[PDB]
């Protein structure tokens, strides 16, 4: 049933800094990284592990939705893997019936890190809508990761 797309990016920042930003500090880092997109992010419930509930509030007028609620579905500190599944809003209002993003961080050297991006998705329509193809949604993820790199290196 579930379709999967993978890509990779390499960022010139170290593993621990990236992993902290993407996990325990996500709610304060994301608005600083994406100040023209994300107004704020809250932890609704949970400690950061599986089943933690997050809400991302967006600036209106950019996308067809002004929030997304996410739930953590994987949290592995040894492999530095975190998965976020959309619960409400987000791409569920744009043509998909299921969406999840999983990041896995691997050190290349002290200040260079490989980021694997896995996008899992489904849609009810016989043909997928263009704006929610993973080739397109991954572009936004890569935009974010590059902005995260820029934020951490400052
Ligand atoms: C530019 C982006 C990329 C977002 C969607 C957004 O439009 C704004 C917020 C990004 C993001 C930030 C943190 C998480 O990595 C993510 C999966 C999410 O929920 O929100 C990230 C998410 C994504 O990678 O799909």
Curated annotation (Swiss-Prot):
CDD domains: Bet_v1-like. The keyword Acyltransferase does not apply. It holds the Pfam family Bet_v_1. The keyword Protein biosynthesis does not apply. One of its GO terms (biological process) is defense response. GO terms for molecular function: abscisic acid binding; protein phosphatase inhibitor activity; signaling receptor activity. One of its GO terms (cellular component) is nucleus. Keywords: Gibberellin signaling pathway, Pathogenesis-related protein, Plant defense. Signal peptide: none annotated. Gibberellin A3 binds at residues 22, 68, 141. It comes from the Eukaryota. InterPro entries: Bet_v_I/MLP (IPR000916), Plant_def-hormone_signal (IPR050279), START-like_dom_sf (IPR023393). Binds gibberellin A3 (GA3) in vitro. Belongs to the BetVI family. This is Phytohormone-binding protein. It comes from Medicago truncatula. The lineage of its organism: Eukaryota, Viridiplantae, Streptophyta, Embryophyta, Tracheophyta.
């Amino acid at each position: 049933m579930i379709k999967e797309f993978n890509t990779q990016t390499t960022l010139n920042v170290g593993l621990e800094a990236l992993w902290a930003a993407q996990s325990k500090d996500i709610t304060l880092v994301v608005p600083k990284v994406l100040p023209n997109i994300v107004k704020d992010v809250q932890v609704i419930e949970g400690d950061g592990g599986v089943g933690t509930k997050l809400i991302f509030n967006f600036l209106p007028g950019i996308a067809p939705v002004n929030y997304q609620r996410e739930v953590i579905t994987e949290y592995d500190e040894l492999s530095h893997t975190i998965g976020l599944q959309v619960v409400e809003g987000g791409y569920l209002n744009q043509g998909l019936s299921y969406y999840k993003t999983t990041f896995q961080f691997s050190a290349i050297s002290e200040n260079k890190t490989l980021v694997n991006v896995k996008i899992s998705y489904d849609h009810e329509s016989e043909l997928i809508e263009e704006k929610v193809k993973p080739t397109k949604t991954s572009e936004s993820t890569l935009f974010y990761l590059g902005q995260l790199e820029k934020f951490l290196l400052n």
